[PDB]
Structure 1
Amino acid sequence: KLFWRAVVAEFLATTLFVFISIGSALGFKYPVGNNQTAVQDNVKVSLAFGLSIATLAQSVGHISGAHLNPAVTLGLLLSCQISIFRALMYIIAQCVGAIVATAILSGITSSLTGNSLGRNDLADGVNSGQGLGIEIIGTLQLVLCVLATTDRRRRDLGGSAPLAIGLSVALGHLLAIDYTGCGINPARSFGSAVITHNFSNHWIFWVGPFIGGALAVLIYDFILAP
């Protein structure tokens, strides 16, 4: 029964997550153009995405669904069994949540209109192929810490891990951000794209996190043999 509140636990959560995130960012560009946000001061933006996850993680399901992206899950699968690993649901959740996440935004935020957007949070690029690697190295540590944190002992009473992970993820963004918006999570993309998505990129983004996370568990496995 749990596996189901579990999904919703994330269906919901993730939504809340991406809304805030997309909240603050857009939060900053808005009253009449040229005053503070000609081009918004990046860390707070990082902070929003950053801190967010750790809170939302400290609250939701614990040993089970807490996270909010596909890369983490597979990193997990990687072992001997898919007999119970129907984590593919988690992804569809993480995806559907994102859409009512971006959707609920346009609803309120509906006057943000110069050559108006609330833009593809990511694949925009005044770059070419560089965009690719950057994110793939970042999730590498995220997934890394995500599993590190887990080895012997499970969930908190001192709450370090979540605070940890959250700010860890934050790191991704400080950097992730400029070149092509923050990319450590699949869901974050669809929601943005749902309007007009022009880059073959935002998903070369996905395979990225996977692969970043691919060598991530591969390098975390040989660390010392399970």
Structure 2
Amino acid sequence: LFWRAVVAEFLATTLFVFISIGSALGFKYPVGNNQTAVQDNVKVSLAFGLSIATLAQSVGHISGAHLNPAVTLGLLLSCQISIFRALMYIIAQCVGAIVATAILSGITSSLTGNSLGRNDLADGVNSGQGLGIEIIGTLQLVLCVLATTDRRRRDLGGSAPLAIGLSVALGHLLAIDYTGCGINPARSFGSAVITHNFSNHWIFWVGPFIGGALAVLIYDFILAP
């Protein structure tokens, strides 16, 4: 049923976001200077992608397992996710992330103020610079998704969820640390709501939007017909 998908996406995002920040957080907690002075990212990129690949099987069976308003937005233009479906879907995806961080708050305290659960730009990375990164990051992800819903040389065989998550994993490998790999307004927002915002918030929300649109532009018009 229609409504079932909404809750499906909702819970899906909830557990997904939890795992994502859970890993990154996980390495940094036991008594400061021992292993995680600055964590070993490959684990983090992995979890971030692997997660998507798994629930994409479980929940993505019905809802679609978008877990990303931007991806849904890109899909809106091409995949035609219905004028009304998109709106509700984004609502469920957005709110779910919030419960995720909320539930994770009940852990420990060390530094309240700077980059804790949320992503931001470090040192010599001007906002514009940060913008292009996310633009491309999402552009990649959307490209893979639209790609999965069509014939392809020796067709994918069957590991569709794995392929997409791997695409997320790659998109992650490039900007996981660069921009905290936003490419998903839900992930950036969820963290933003609990700490509760910062002016730099626009970047991580505008990039995926513009990037996804640019992505379809390439496939739809030049790489589709």
Report the TM-score range of the alignment, normalised by the length of the smaller protein.
0.7 to 0.9
Q: 1:57 to 1:153 in 2, by over 3 A?
A: farther
Q: What CA distance in whole angstroms lies between the structure 1 residues aligned with 2:16 and 2:35?
A: 25
Displacement after TM superposition at 1:134 (Å): 0.6
Residues of 1 paired with 2:184 and 2:5: CA distance? Answer: 19
| 1:162-184 deviation per Cα after TM superposition (whole angstroms, max 9, x unaligned) | 10000110112122122331211
Please say which of residues 109-118 and 68-77 is displaced more in the overlay. 109-118
Q: Indicate the larger mover: 212-221 or 70-79.
A: 70-79
- TM-score, normalised to structure 2's length? 0.86
Secondary structure at the counterpart of residue 136 of structure 2: helix
Shift of 1:212: 0.8
Q: Shift of residue 153 of structure 1?
A: 9.6
SS class of match (1:87): helix
Moved more, 169-178 or 153-162: 153-162
CA 1:107–1:76: 2 relative to 1, 3 Å: same
Match of 1:211 in 2: 210
- Indicate how the Cα distance of structure 1 residues 210 and 110 shifts in structure 2: closer, same or farther if over 3 A, else same: same
Displacement of 1:130 after TM fit? 1.3
RMSD of aligned residue pairs (Cα, Å)? 3.3
TM-score, normalization by structure 1: 0.85
**Would you say the 8 A contact 1:121–1:192 is kept in 2?**
no
- More divergent stretch after superposition (67-76 vs 23-32): 67-76
Contact 1:120/1:193 (8 A) holds in 2: no
Q: 1:144 to 1:72 in 2, by over 3 A?
A: same
Asked whether the 8 Å contact 2:76–2:82 carries over to 1, the reply is no
In the aligned structure 2, how far is the partner of 1:224 from the partner of 1:60? 30
More deviation in 122-131 or 158-167? Answer: 122-131
* 8 Å contact from structure 1 (residues 63, 155) kept in 2: no
- Kept after mapping to 1: 8 A contact 2:6/2:63: no
For 1:29-60, what per-residue CA distance to the aligned partner results, in whole angstroms no more than 9, with x for missing partners? Answer: 11011011000001100011111001010111
Alignment deviations for residues 177-216 of structure 1 (CA, whole Å, 9 cap, x no partner) = 2233121101001111113355433333222112111011
Distance 1:59 1:197, change over 3 A: same
CA displacement at 1:144 relative to structure 2: 0.5
> For 1:109-130, what per-residue CA distance to the aligned partner results, in whole angstroms no more than 9, with x for missing partners?
5678898943447789864431
Equivalences, count: 225
CA distance in 2, matches of 1:116, 1:152: 42
Structure 1 Cα separation of the partners of residues 131 and 160 of structure 2:
29
Q: Distance in 1 between matches of 2:44 and 2:180?
A: 11
The residue number in structure 1 matching 2:162 is 163
Query: 1:57, 1:6 → 2: CA distance?
Result: 13
Per the alignment, do residues 125 and 138 of structure 1 end up closer, same or farther by CA in structure 2, a change over 3 Å counting? Answer: same
Q: CA deviation at 1:142?
A: 0.6
Contact kept? 1:125, 1:131, Cα under 8 Å: no
Deviation for aligned residue 1:61: 3.6
Bigger share in helix: 2
SS of aligned partner of 1:223: helix
* Partner Cα separation in structure 1 for residue 109 and residue 26 of structure 2: 12
Provide structure 1 residue ranges, at least 5 long, that are not aligned to the other structure. Answer: none
Assess if the C-alpha contact under 8 Å between 1:176 and 1:182 holds in 2.
yes
Question: Contact (CA 8 Å) 2:98, 2:194: kept in 1 or not?
Answer: no
Cα 1:128–1:81 change in 2 (3 A) is: closer
**Mean Cα displacement is larger for which, 195-204 or 61-70?**
195-204
Q: Deviations over 1:134-180 (max 9, x none)?
A: 11101111100101110259999953111000011011212212233
Match of 2:84, SS state, is coil
Higher mean C-alpha deviation, range 113-122 or range 32-41: 113-122
Structure 2 portions without partners, runs of 5+: none
Are the counterparts in 2 of residues 124 and 180 from structure 1 also a CA contact under 8 Å? no
Instruction: Say which is worse superposed, 34-43 or 113-122, in terms of deviation.
Output: 113-122
